[PDB]
Amino acid sequence: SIKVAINGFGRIGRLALRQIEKAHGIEVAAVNDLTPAEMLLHLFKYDSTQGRFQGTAELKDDAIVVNGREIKVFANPNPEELPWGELGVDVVLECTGFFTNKTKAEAHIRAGARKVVISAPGGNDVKTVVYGVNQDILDGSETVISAASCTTNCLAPMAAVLQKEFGVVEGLMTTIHAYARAAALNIVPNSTGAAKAIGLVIPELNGKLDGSAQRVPVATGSLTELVSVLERPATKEEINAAMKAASSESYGYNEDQIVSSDVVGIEYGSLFDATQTRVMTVGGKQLVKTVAWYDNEMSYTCQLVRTLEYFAGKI
Template sequence: MTVRVAINGFGRIGRNIVRAIYESGRKDIDVVAVNDLGPVETNAHLMRYDSVHGRFPKSVSVDGDTIHIEGGDSFKVLAERDPSKLPWKELGVDIALECTGIFTAKEKAVAHIEAGAKRVIVSAPASGADFTVVYGVNHDKLTKDHIVISNASCTTNCLAPVAKVLNDAFGIEKGFMTTIHAYTGDQPTLDTMHKDLYRARAAAVSMIPTSTGAAKAVGLVLPELQGKLDGVAIRVPTPNVSVVDFKFVPKNKVTVEEVNAALVAAADGSLNGILAYTDEPLVSIDLNHNAASSTFALDQTKVVEGDLVRVMSWYDNEWGFSNRMADTAAAVGKLL
């Protein structure tokens, strides 16, 4: 079955979802429409040329309100502020991918259902969501009763596979995560007014401490870890690729070799394509455009006296997450 999707918000994630679908060659998802308030030609131009990920792999053209992609595919570009007024019923939309960052709460996201979509997947944590999914970790628990679904955050998608493997293998008594995170579009290029004074500062000139709910959100995905994890973020002056530094106390003493072996086995097995690993001395740029949710660095594992463990895992916070949005859409489509 090919699931028909529409994307609300054609920014970093919205555009990369389209790109992920075409670069992977998948035929189980058909993008029928995009809703974005910017001009159609501007949306097409930003699709063709990307400062982080390079040129779009196919030629892109515009005809009226439609973007055409080399090979015969096309989708309409709408400009409607109220998602409840979008023509999802008329266009036969199965799933709306809510990527604006505005309509994240369930009571706002259901506007897409009112407009005729059968399901909504929010590209962010979503308060009140029927289900929070991290593909590869708990997507097998999706049901037909889940209407508004959160795809969590890019950081939760990085941490959750690692936490699942470590908890299954050794048990996690408690843990703390620091994500060293690339700056994103909601940060200013120069100092400006913001209710969070950390977020008021220029993105590209400082390391900026800030909050994140990514670690706590793992408890939504893995209930057995509810209340056991917390974390913080430090935004750094790079445009893409982030890294999770995770420290935890295991139930029993472990070694570096045991920790690495458990993660490698999962990456080669049940979490293949979601969790990856490297034994090379990589830096962040080396992981740009990497589709895995989480790439574990074998040489960064540290164990102190057997009961304090530190692991590190990279993630392309745009590309990996966008690929998981597509994976989740396909999984939800099978339930319709």
């Protein structure tokens, strides 16, 4: 049974523990955070947006007991000094935001852990995995991997169906991110690398996509729009049917008229919105728009934990 440690028991780290508690063959043995256990427990159990933890959780000396099992709590800012080897930790879920490349994340391996999964893009010597699109690139010999970004997890399953079933010539992405000091009150255009980087996840789309982001100062569901030129003719109905045929626990399918609060709490990495699909045909030339939603916290966390569980099965 695989032992995990969560480094950074923040928004993502806490939700990741909620999801790992649903699984067999894997358990969190320890968490590390700069915040005292007392407050971390309250934030883990009670959440205004993602609801109450569905399980038991209590505080002990230097530990939290979740569903009857002790989880050690540490507060050490330096990962090299954590007792991962002494505790037999197999995999560290790195969720602090401060160790998001290979050389920084390998501090966990110098501390005795065997593997690391970064909760963010990890650089170019680190495999990047969107569960449901490319987890089969993992064979278990990797030491550090990445579960990509929230935008990549939203875009990739949609782009993958378009590429597999129609062929993509090119496309431009616009992501509306529901969240420097400007961003609190303004719509703010922002660079993203997610579309440019999509070849890390879908090699066939390398060099075919670009895009950017509009950061909107409201906390709610986010969305990614893709405007593409395809290699074969398409109807709205045919595109929507292909997306539904691909739907899964990672890729949801929606045909309701929804608003952004309806997305909060989904466990899909991406929720394809079939009501927004449009195909413009002018003189035989076609231009296609497709839109998928994501819950920036929960969608990413559920993908992260799926990727972790799959990786954990390869060792």
